[PDB]
Coordinates of C-alpha atoms and ligand atoms in Angstrom, one line a residue:
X1 CA 115.4 -69.4 -2.8
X2 CA 116.9 -70.3 -6.4
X3 CA 119.7 -69.0 -7.9
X4 CA 120.6 -70.9 -11.1
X5 CA 123.4 -69.3 -12.1
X6 CA 123.9 -67.2 -9.3
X7 CA 125.4 -64.6 -11.9
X8 CA 122.3 -64.7 -14.0
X9 CA 120.6 -60.8 -14.0
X10 CA 117.8 -61.0 -15.9
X11 CA 116.6 -57.5 -17.8
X12 CA 113.6 -56.6 -16.9
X13 CA 111.5 -53.9 -18.9
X14 CA 108.0 -52.1 -17.6
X15 CA 106.7 -50.1 -20.6
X16 CA 103.5 -47.7 -19.8
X17 CA 101.9 -46.5 -23.2
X18 CA 99.5 -44.0 -23.4
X19 CA 98.4 -41.3 -20.5
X20 CA 97.4 -44.2 -17.5
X21 CA 100.6 -46.0 -18.8
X22 CA 102.7 -43.5 -18.4
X23 CA 101.7 -42.0 -15.3
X24 CA 101.5 -45.4 -13.3
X25 CA 105.3 -46.2 -14.8
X26 CA 106.0 -42.4 -12.5
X27 CA 104.3 -43.6 -9.6
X28 CA 106.7 -46.5 -9.6
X29 CA 109.4 -44.4 -10.2
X30 CA 108.9 -42.0 -7.1
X31 CA 108.5 -45.0 -5.0
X32 CA 112.1 -46.5 -6.2
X33 CA 110.7 -49.8 -7.7
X34 CA 114.1 -51.1 -8.5
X35 CA 115.6 -53.9 -10.4
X36 CA 114.0 -53.1 -13.8
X37 CA 114.5 -50.4 -17.1
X38 CA 111.2 -47.4 -17.4
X39 CA 110.0 -46.9 -20.9
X40 CA 106.9 -44.5 -21.4
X41 CA 105.5 -44.6 -24.6
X42 CA 102.8 -41.6 -26.4
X43 CA 101.7 -40.1 -29.6
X44 CA 101.1 -36.8 -27.4
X45 CA 105.0 -35.4 -27.5
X46 CA 103.6 -32.7 -24.9
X47 CA 102.7 -35.2 -22.0
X48 CA 106.5 -37.3 -22.3
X49 CA 107.6 -34.3 -20.8
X50 CA 107.1 -34.6 -17.2
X51 CA 107.8 -38.5 -17.8
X52 CA 111.3 -39.2 -15.8
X53 CA 111.2 -42.6 -17.6
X54 CA 114.7 -44.1 -18.7
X55 CA 113.5 -44.2 -22.4
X56 CA 110.7 -41.9 -23.9
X57 CA 109.5 -43.0 -27.3
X58 CA 107.0 -40.0 -29.2
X59 CA 105.0 -42.7 -31.5
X60 CA 102.8 -39.6 -33.0
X61 CA 103.3 -38.0 -36.0
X62 CA 106.0 -35.4 -37.6
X63 CA 105.0 -31.4 -37.1
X64 CA 101.5 -32.5 -34.9
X65 CA 100.7 -34.0 -31.9
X66 CA 98.0 -36.3 -30.7
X71 CA 91.1 -40.5 -28.8
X72 CA 90.7 -43.2 -31.1
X73 CA 92.1 -46.6 -30.8
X74 CA 92.8 -47.0 -34.5
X75 CA 95.4 -44.2 -34.6
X76 CA 96.8 -45.4 -32.1
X77 CA 97.1 -49.5 -33.2
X78 CA 98.8 -47.2 -36.7
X79 CA 100.8 -45.0 -34.4
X80 CA 102.8 -47.6 -32.6
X81 CA 103.2 -50.0 -36.0
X82 CA 104.8 -47.2 -37.3
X83 CA 106.9 -47.5 -34.9
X84 CA 108.0 -51.2 -34.8
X85 CA 111.5 -50.8 -35.3
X86 CA 112.1 -47.7 -32.3
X87 CA 110.1 -50.0 -30.7
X88 CA 111.9 -53.4 -31.0
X89 CA 115.0 -51.0 -30.8
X90 CA 114.3 -50.4 -27.2
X91 CA 113.1 -53.5 -25.7
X92 CA 116.5 -55.9 -27.5
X93 CA 117.8 -57.6 -24.3
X94 CA 115.3 -58.4 -22.0
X95 CA 114.8 -61.3 -20.5
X96 CA 110.9 -59.5 -19.4
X97 CA 108.4 -57.0 -20.8
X98 CA 105.3 -55.2 -18.9
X99 CA 102.6 -53.5 -20.7
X100 CA 100.7 -51.1 -18.8
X101 CA 98.3 -48.9 -19.6
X102 CA 95.1 -47.3 -18.6
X103 CA 92.6 -48.7 -21.1
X104 CA 89.9 -47.1 -22.5
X105 CA 91.6 -44.3 -24.6
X106 CA 93.8 -44.2 -28.0
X107 CA 97.5 -44.8 -27.4
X108 CA 97.0 -47.1 -24.8
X109 CA 94.3 -49.3 -26.0
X110 CA 95.8 -49.6 -29.8
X111 CA 99.0 -49.7 -29.2
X112 CA 99.1 -51.6 -25.9
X113 CA 98.5 -54.8 -28.5
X114 CA 101.5 -53.8 -30.9
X115 CA 103.7 -53.3 -27.8
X116 CA 103.0 -57.1 -26.3
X117 CA 103.2 -58.4 -29.8
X118 CA 107.0 -56.7 -30.7
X119 CA 108.6 -58.3 -27.2
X120 CA 107.2 -61.4 -27.4
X121 CA 108.6 -61.8 -31.3
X122 CA 112.2 -60.7 -29.3
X123 CA 110.9 -63.7 -26.7
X124 CA 110.5 -61.7 -23.9
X125 CA 108.1 -63.2 -20.8
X126 CA 105.5 -60.4 -22.5
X127 CA 102.8 -58.8 -18.8
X128 CA 99.7 -57.1 -19.6
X129 CA 99.2 -54.9 -16.9
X130 CA 95.7 -52.9 -17.1
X131 CA 92.9 -51.2 -15.8
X132 CA 89.5 -51.0 -17.1
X133 CA 88.4 -47.5 -17.0
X134 CA 85.9 -46.0 -14.1
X135 CA 82.6 -46.0 -14.4
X136 CA 82.3 -41.6 -14.4
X137 CA 84.7 -42.2 -17.4
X138 CA 81.7 -42.6 -19.3
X139 CA 80.1 -45.1 -21.7
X140 CA 81.9 -45.1 -24.7
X141 CA 85.9 -45.7 -23.4
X142 CA 84.9 -48.6 -21.4
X143 CA 83.7 -50.1 -24.8
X144 CA 86.7 -48.8 -25.9
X145 CA 88.7 -50.5 -23.1
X146 CA 86.9 -54.1 -23.4
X147 CA 87.5 -54.3 -27.5
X148 CA 91.4 -53.2 -26.1
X149 CA 91.2 -55.5 -23.9
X150 CA 90.6 -59.0 -26.3
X151 CA 93.3 -57.7 -28.6
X152 CA 95.9 -57.7 -25.6
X153 CA 95.1 -61.1 -23.7
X154 CA 95.8 -62.5 -27.5
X155 CA 99.5 -61.4 -27.6
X156 CA 100.7 -61.8 -24.0
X157 CA 101.8 -64.6 -22.5
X158 CA 100.0 -63.3 -18.4
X159 CA 97.2 -60.5 -19.1
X160 CA 96.7 -58.7 -15.9
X161 CA 93.5 -56.8 -15.5
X162 CA 91.9 -54.6 -12.7
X163 CA 88.8 -52.8 -12.5
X164 CA 89.0 -49.6 -11.4
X165 CA 85.6 -49.0 -10.2
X166 CA 86.3 -51.7 -8.0
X167 CA 89.1 -49.4 -6.2
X168 CA 86.4 -46.2 -5.2
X172 CA 82.3 -45.6 1.4
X173 CA 83.5 -41.8 1.6
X174 CA 83.4 -39.6 -2.1
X175 CA 86.5 -39.2 -2.9
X176 CA 87.9 -36.6 -5.7
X177 CA 89.2 -37.7 -9.6
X178 CA 92.6 -36.8 -8.7
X179 CA 92.4 -39.4 -6.0
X180 CA 90.6 -42.3 -7.8
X181 CA 93.7 -42.2 -10.8
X182 CA 96.3 -41.8 -8.3
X183 CA 94.5 -45.1 -6.7
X184 CA 94.8 -46.5 -11.0
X185 CA 98.5 -45.5 -10.3
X186 CA 99.0 -47.5 -7.3
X187 CA 97.4 -50.1 -8.0
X188 CA 99.4 -51.1 -11.4
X189 CA 102.3 -50.4 -9.8
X190 CA 101.5 -53.2 -7.6
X191 CA 101.1 -55.5 -10.2
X192 CA 104.2 -54.9 -11.5
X193 CA 106.0 -54.7 -8.7
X194 CA 104.1 -58.1 -6.7
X195 CA 106.2 -60.1 -9.2
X196 CA 109.0 -58.2 -9.8
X197 CA 110.7 -57.8 -5.7
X198 CA 110.5 -61.5 -6.3
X199 CA 112.9 -62.0 -8.8
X200 CA 116.5 -63.2 -7.8
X201 CA 119.2 -60.9 -8.4
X202 CA 122.7 -61.7 -8.8
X203 CA 123.1 -59.3 -4.7
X204 CA 119.6 -60.9 -3.4
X205 CA 118.6 -64.6 -3.9
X206 CA 114.3 -64.8 -4.1
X207 CA 112.4 -67.0 -7.0
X208 CA 114.4 -67.8 -9.7
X209 CA 113.1 -65.8 -13.1
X210 CA 112.2 -69.6 -14.3
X211 CA 109.4 -70.0 -12.0
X212 CA 108.2 -67.0 -12.9
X213 CA 108.4 -68.2 -16.7
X214 CA 106.5 -71.5 -15.7
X215 CA 103.7 -70.1 -14.3
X216 CA 103.1 -66.5 -16.2
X217 CA 104.0 -68.0 -20.3
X218 CA 101.4 -68.4 -22.5
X219 CA 98.8 -68.7 -18.8
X220 CA 96.2 -66.6 -19.9
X221 CA 94.2 -64.2 -18.1
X222 CA 94.6 -63.3 -14.7
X223 CA 93.0 -61.8 -11.8
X224 CA 95.3 -59.8 -8.5
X225 CA 94.4 -59.6 -5.1
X226 CA 96.2 -57.4 -2.4
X227 CA 95.8 -57.0 1.2
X228 CA 97.3 -55.3 4.1
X229 CA 97.2 -55.8 8.2
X230 CA 99.2 -54.5 11.5
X231 CA 99.2 -56.5 15.1
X232 CA 99.2 -59.8 15.9
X233 CA 98.1 -61.7 12.9
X234 CA 99.3 -59.3 10.4
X235 CA 100.6 -61.7 7.7
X236 CA 97.1 -64.0 7.5
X237 CA 95.0 -61.3 8.0
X238 CA 96.6 -59.4 5.1
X239 CA 96.7 -62.5 2.8
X240 CA 92.4 -63.1 3.9
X241 CA 92.2 -59.3 3.0
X242 CA 94.2 -60.1 -0.9
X243 CA 92.0 -63.6 -1.5
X244 CA 88.5 -61.7 -0.8
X245 CA 89.9 -58.1 -2.5
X246 CA 86.9 -57.3 -4.8
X247 CA 89.8 -57.0 -8.3
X248 CA 90.2 -60.8 -7.2
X249 CA 86.8 -61.6 -6.8
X250 CA 87.3 -65.0 -5.1
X251 CA 88.6 -67.5 -9.1
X252 CA 91.5 -68.9 -7.4
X253 CA 90.1 -72.3 -7.1
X254 CA 90.1 -71.9 -11.3
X255 CA 93.6 -70.6 -11.4
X256 CA 96.2 -73.3 -12.7
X257 CA 98.9 -71.2 -11.5
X258 CA 99.0 -68.5 -8.3
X259 CA 102.1 -66.4 -7.2
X260 CA 102.0 -65.0 -3.6
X261 CA 104.2 -62.1 -2.8
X262 CA 104.5 -61.2 0.7
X263 CA 105.9 -57.7 2.3
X264 CA 106.8 -56.9 5.3
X265 CA 109.1 -55.2 7.7
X266 CA 112.8 -55.6 8.9
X267 CA 111.4 -57.9 12.0
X268 CA 109.7 -60.4 9.2
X269 CA 109.6 -64.0 10.1
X270 CA 109.5 -67.1 8.7
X271 CA 106.6 -68.6 10.4
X272 CA 104.4 -65.8 9.5
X273 CA 105.6 -66.2 6.3
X274 CA 104.5 -70.2 5.9
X275 CA 101.0 -69.1 7.8
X276 CA 100.2 -66.7 5.1
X277 CA 101.5 -69.2 2.1
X278 CA 99.6 -72.2 3.2
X279 CA 96.2 -69.6 3.7
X280 CA 97.1 -69.0 -0.4
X281 CA 97.8 -72.4 -1.1
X282 CA 94.1 -74.1 0.9
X283 CA 92.6 -71.3 -1.4
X284 CA 94.4 -72.3 -4.6
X285 CA 93.6 -75.4 -6.7
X286 CA 95.5 -78.9 -5.3
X287 CA 97.1 -79.3 -8.8
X288 CA 98.0 -75.8 -9.2
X289 CA 101.6 -74.2 -9.0
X290 CA 102.6 -72.2 -6.5
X291 CA 105.4 -70.0 -6.5
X292 CA 106.0 -67.4 -3.5
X293 CA 108.7 -65.0 -2.5
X294 CA 109.3 -62.7 0.0
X295 CA 110.9 -59.3 0.3
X296 CA 112.4 -57.1 3.6
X297 CA 110.9 -53.0 2.8
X298 CA 112.5 -51.4 6.2
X299 CA 110.2 -49.1 5.5
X300 CA 107.0 -50.7 6.2
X301 CA 107.7 -51.2 10.2
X302 CA 104.7 -53.8 11.6
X303 CA 103.0 -53.5 8.7
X304 CA 102.5 -56.8 6.1
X305 CA 101.3 -56.8 2.4
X306 CA 100.2 -59.6 0.8
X307 CA 99.7 -59.7 -3.2
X308 CA 97.8 -62.8 -4.6
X309 CA 97.9 -63.2 -8.8
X310 CA 96.0 -65.5 -10.0
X311 CA 97.0 -66.8 -13.6
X312 CA 95.2 -69.3 -16.4
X313 CA 91.6 -70.2 -16.3
Ligands
CL401 CL1 118.0 -50.8 -9.6
CL402 CL1 104.0 -38.2 -40.3
MG403 MG1 116.8 -46.9 -12.4
MG404 MG1 109.1 -36.3 -12.0
MG405 MG1 108.4 -39.7 -35.5
MG406 MG1 114.2 -58.5 -8.6

């Protein structure tokens, strides 16, 4: 555990841009994600009214509302000064979106570029659309991700197709997509040392995530005797991570447990993840207590730099 100096308060901002992004940010607010500022950005003013974000930005046109990523790109570039003033002061900025639409696809690279011009550690957390969303959205998402990769420090890409065996509604599918974008953000933020709780220093996260490039995520959860090892096993074998950990230059491990979380099982899960990663990889890990979990252990692995 490191706090240098122990009074340093890191400023973290989570931007949701477009429909999927604004929805994921609201899910983080509902789940009570702490220590971060929430920002919602959309071109559609009506789609911003239910957002509970701290700051809401309508980057659409005057006297009009509202598919095309170029429109999304132009809307964000035309509101560059407005986006800049809401990101000013951040040590770290997350850019989150559901790739495939107009606003998120086109707008997220502009948000990422503004965050980096302010020297923030800039992390993209996006989803690839579900197959049922169709070919055009999948095509637009792929061009959108290629654009965003060039404007962020690290880009976590989560395929929505690897989330959904029983039939789930479109509503349940989109609820699961919000939940996975929250896991991507919370995995990192919950570990960052705060003046009231010493854990992983912001400099350590920055050393792994800064200019790392592409990143993959794995999630796992277990109960019982070997709950920590079994959760870690599930995360390193997760369909979203597609077992590439051996290629990563850096690995971030987040262990979340109940009030009875012991140091021994934390270390067991830590060495299991370390054994799967490359010998020359930088491994940073943190553990946090969420009293609501009970006899459950949740593991999040982020493999960055390939
Ligand atoms: Cl807080
Ligand atoms: Cl206008
Ligand atoms: Mg708050
Ligand atoms: Mg609400
Ligand atoms: Mg305007
Ligand atoms: Mg923190």
